[PDB]
Amino acid sequence: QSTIEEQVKTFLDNFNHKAEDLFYQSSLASWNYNTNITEENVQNMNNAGDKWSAFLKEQSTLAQMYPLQEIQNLQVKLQLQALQQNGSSVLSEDKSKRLNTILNTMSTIYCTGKVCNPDNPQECLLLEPGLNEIMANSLDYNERLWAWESWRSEVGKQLRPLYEEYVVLKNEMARANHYEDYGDYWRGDYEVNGVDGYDYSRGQLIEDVEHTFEEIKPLYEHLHAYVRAKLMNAYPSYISPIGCLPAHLLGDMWGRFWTNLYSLTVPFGQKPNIDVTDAMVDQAWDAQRIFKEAEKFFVSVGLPNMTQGFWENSMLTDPGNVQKACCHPTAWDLGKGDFRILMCTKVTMDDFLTAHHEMGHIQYDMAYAAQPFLLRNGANEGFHEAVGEIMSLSAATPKHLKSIGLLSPDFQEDNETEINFLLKQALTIVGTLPFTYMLEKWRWMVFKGEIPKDQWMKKWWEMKREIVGVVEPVPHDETYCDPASLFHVSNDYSFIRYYTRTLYQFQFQEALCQAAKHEGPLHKCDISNSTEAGQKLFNMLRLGKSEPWTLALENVVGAKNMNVRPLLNYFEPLFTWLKDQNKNSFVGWSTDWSPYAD
Amino acid sequence: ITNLCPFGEVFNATRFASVYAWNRKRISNCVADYSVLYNSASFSTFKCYGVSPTKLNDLCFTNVYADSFVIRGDEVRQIAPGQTGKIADYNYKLPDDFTGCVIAWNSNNLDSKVGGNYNYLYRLFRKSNLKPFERDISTEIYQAGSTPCNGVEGFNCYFPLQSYGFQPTNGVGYQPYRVVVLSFELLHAPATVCGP
Numbered sequence: 001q002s003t004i005e006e007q008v009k010t011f012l013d014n015f016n017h018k019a020e021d022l023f024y025q026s027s028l029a030s031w032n033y034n035t036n037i038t039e040e041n042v043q044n045m046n047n048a049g050d051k052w053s054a055f056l057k058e059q060s061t062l063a064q065m066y067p068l069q070e071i072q073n074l075q076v077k078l079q080l081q082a083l084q085q086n087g088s089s090v091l092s093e094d095k096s097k098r099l100n101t102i103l104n105t106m107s108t109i110y111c112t113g114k115v116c117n118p119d120n121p122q123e124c125l126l127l128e129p130g131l132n133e134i135m136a137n138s139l140d141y142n143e144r145l146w147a148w149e150s151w152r153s154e155v156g157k158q159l160r161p162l163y164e165e166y167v168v169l170k171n172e173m174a175r176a177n178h179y180e181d182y183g184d185y186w187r188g189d190y191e192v193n194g195v196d197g198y199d200y201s202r203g204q205l206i207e208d209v210e211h212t213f214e215e216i217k218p219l220y221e222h223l224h225a226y227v228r229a230k231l232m233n234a235y236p237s238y239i240s241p242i243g244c245l246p247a248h249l250l251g252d253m254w255g256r257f258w259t260n261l262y263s264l265t266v267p268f269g270q271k272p273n274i275d276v277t278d279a280m281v282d283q284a285w286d287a288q289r290i291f292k293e294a295e296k297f298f299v300s301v302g303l304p305n306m307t308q309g310f311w312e313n314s315m316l317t318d319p320g321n322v323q324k325a326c327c328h329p330t331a332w333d334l335g336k337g338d339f340r341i342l343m344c345t346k347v348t349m350d351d352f353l354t355a356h357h358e359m360g361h362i363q364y365d366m367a368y369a370a371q372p373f374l375l376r377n378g379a380n381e382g383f384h385e386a387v388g389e390i391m392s393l394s395a396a397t398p399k400h401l402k403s404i405g406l407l408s409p410d411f412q413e414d415n416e417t418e419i420n421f422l423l424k425q426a427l428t429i430v431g432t433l434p435f436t437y438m439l440e441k442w443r444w445m446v447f448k449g450e451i452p453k454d455q456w457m458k459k460w461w462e463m464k465r466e467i468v469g470v471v472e473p474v475p476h477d478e479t480y481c482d483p484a485s486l487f488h489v490s491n492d493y494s495f496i497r498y499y500t501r502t503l504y505q506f507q508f509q510e511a512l513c514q515a516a517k518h519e520g521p522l523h524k525c526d527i528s529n530s531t532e533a534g535q536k537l538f539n540m541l542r543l544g545k546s547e548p549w550t551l552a553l554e555n556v557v558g559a560k561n562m563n564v565r566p567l568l569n570y571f572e573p574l575f576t577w578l579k580d581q582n583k584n585s586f587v588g589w590s591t592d593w594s595p596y597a598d
Numbered sequence: 599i600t601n602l603c604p605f606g607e608v609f610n611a612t613r614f615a616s617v618y619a620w621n622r623k624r625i626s627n628c629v630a631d632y633s634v635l636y637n638s639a640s641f642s643t644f645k646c647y648g649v650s651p652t653k654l655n656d657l658c659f660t661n662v663y664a665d666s667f668v669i670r671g672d673e674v675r676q677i678a679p680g681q682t683g684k685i686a687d688y689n690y691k692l693p694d695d696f697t698g699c700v701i702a703w704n705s706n707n708l709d710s711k712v713g714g715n716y717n718y719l720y721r722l723f724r725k726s727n728l729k730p731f732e733r734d735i736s737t738e739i740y741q742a743g744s745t746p747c748n749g750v751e752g753f754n755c756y757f758p759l760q761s762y763g764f765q766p767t768n769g770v771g772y773q774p775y776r777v778v779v780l781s782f783e784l785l786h787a788p789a790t791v792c793g794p
């Protein structure tokens with residue numbers, strides 16, 4: 001009996017001391033590559049990557065010998081089952097290298113793709129800052145439309161054949177691992193089994209996502225109605241009062257966040273502005289000040305101040321034309337106590353809150369670092385993207401902004417300030433939900449089947465018109481690939497983490513405000529000085545994967561599933577007001593109206 | 599009028615010992631100015647057990663062993679009497695009634711280099727705990743089950759020791775700390791070491 005527990009415990013205590021450096025050496029080659037796209041780095045990255053995967057196959061093979069049914073300690077059953085799963089090794093070596101070329105080419109096309117001026121081919125725009133400044137600030141419909149379609153025609157059209165191959169190979173790999181498809185592979189992070197009474201299943205995730213979204217559509221239809229009703233002032237001949245919105249007039253290149261619509265849709269413009277972008281520029285803040293102010297929030301709730309290696313090794317400012325670095329913000333744990341952020345910041349409220357969010361990934365990465373190697377990962381994908389966004393819910397408040405000097409000390413917390421704040425939050429948090437659900441529904445179907453090759457773009461744009469209420473400026477045919485033109489689609493990440501975190505952030509926020517002994521409306525709770533609220537969180541961050549997400553949630557907020565009630569109870573003071581504003585105008589949209597045909 | 603001990607030849611030796619096979623120096627027939635070590639600015643740990651650290655320049659002893667080695671800064675909390683974990687259990691054990699001092703400092707500028715150091719080893723499996731002050735410099739393959747191991751690594755058959763891998767950018771809990779453990783002895787006979 002006990003021999004096949006001690007044999008397994010001995011084996012994992014070989015793996016945890018042998019794996020740890022191969023993973024570090026691999027990670028440190030990827031950091032040197034992403035901080036300058038150069039062939040000398042790509043060689044090292046491929047060499048250290050091969051060493052890691054070639055090792056993993058041997059340890060996986062040794063782990064295969066032990067009976068999965070004999071180990072009884074839960075954490076060793078989890079920690080061993082991660083080695084017994086094959087992963088990519090099910091493909092032939094040529095076919096596996098074929099897939100690794102596809103991923104590296106798609107990644108390089110995204111991170112180096114560009115558009116150029118039609119009169120002046122000497123002048124070319126990268127996405128950051130070039131096209132981002134156009135889509136964030138231009139009020140010329142024609143320039144916005146050009147910037148919007150040129151990225152989709154010039155780079156989205158290149159990725160179509162690669163994304164076809166990626167869909168084919170990843171499905172065959174996932175199916176030889178006994179999942180139904182590669183969508184099912186991704187839904188597998190939410191699965192809990194073996195612990196009875198706390199179980200969860202890869203099918204049920206679809207039920208709970210589609211069941212919670214039904215209870216969010218009413219807030220969205222009212223917010224969409226209000227935004228549409230006001231954009232007609234800015235783009236008068238282009239927008240229907242009863243149609244879906246033109247995609248390029250949303251506050252972003254994809255419409256992932258509506259934040260930059262705020263200046264066009266702010267309710268009470270006569271008060272001091274809640275968007276502190278101008279006040280930060282006026283006081284001449286900078287990259288380091290933004291991350292220093294981010295660090296002050298986490299330490300004032302009693303979590304650790306940053307590792308010195310963070311401040312010395314991180315890339316917090318754009319390196320410029322000297323280096324072709326990636327500029328999509330990322331939080332890196334290399335292993336062996338080494339944590340870094342790569343982020344091309346500039347003075348903005350968006351980058352101030354995003355500095356809180358990516359630093360929130362580092363705090364969770366510092367907390368579970370005591371766990372053994374294969375459990376030293378977040379409790380669920382959604383918790384990892386929620387732990388940062390709990391701090392932005394708190395740090396964005398006019399109450400907090402006055403306390404750090406980005407608002408004047410005479411600022412008044414009146415009943416128009418409360419709606420000027422919630423309308424800002426609703427653009428980010430509710431504007432992103434239908435997009436985030438809809439994009440992943442498309443991928444789940446594309447991997448599963450029920451969307452054939454000659455209907456990829458057909459069903460995508462039908463779903464954007466039907467679910468999200470957004471419409472294309474001019475038709476795209478099946479030579480294009482619009483989804484591939486977004487980082488998370490291009491670079492092989494599950495998107496549903498951004499839906500489930502958007503529910504978990506309010507569940508945790510309510511339960512932290514009670515630890516801070518707060519009373520009054522939830523939407524002016526600052527946890528910022530409560531060490532008690534920080535401890536209520538920290539004692540769940542230190543777990544890693546060691547207890548199932550259902551139980552790790554249930555211990556902190558008293559529910560064993562994602563719940564919509566705290567989201568709605570946050571926005572209710574806005575929702576009542578939007579219902580008042582929309583009483584004289586159409587709520588919802590026709591799917592038949594067209595920017596090209598009408 | 600004085601004659602100081604060769605502490606320099608330990609506290610600033612070029613190359614330290616791999617913890618599984620730690621170095622030992624005897625000190626005898628000499629005066630040791632411990633107050634200089636106590637008033638050192640570089641030392642991160644100076645915990646003394648059974649003896650008060652300011653007091654050592656008053657004492658006289660028969661013999662003193664200075665044991666030296668290098669380990670991850672996070673494992674320095676296993677160099678104390680009564681501890682457990684893979685340094686204390688299997689590489690270097692102090693007794694439950696130790697009298698002595700443990701001295702340690704960060705050395706990332708010296709014991710760590712780009713690409714990774716990979717010199718310093720530690721023992722990771724053993725068939726029983728060490729007795730205090732024992733050493734086990736051996737490389738016979740540990741057997742985790744009922745199959746005879748035949749002196750070859752494989753299924754259930756693990757090599758007994760593993761390298762550290764210090765690169766310069768690893769965090770504080772994985773940087774190389776040099777450690778020196780002083781283990782004074784009074785042996786119902788003459789003193790040969792004193793404070794001045």
Ligand SMILES: *[C@@H]1O[C@H](CO)[C@@H](O)[C@H](O)[C@H]1NC(C)=O
Binds near residue numbers: 415416419
């Ligand atoms: C609060 O705001 C509403 C409009 O949002 C306004 O009608 C009301 O008069 C305000 N409260 C007070 C005390 O004036």
Ligand SMILES: [Zn+2]
Binds near residue numbers: 361
């Ligand atoms: Zn993130």
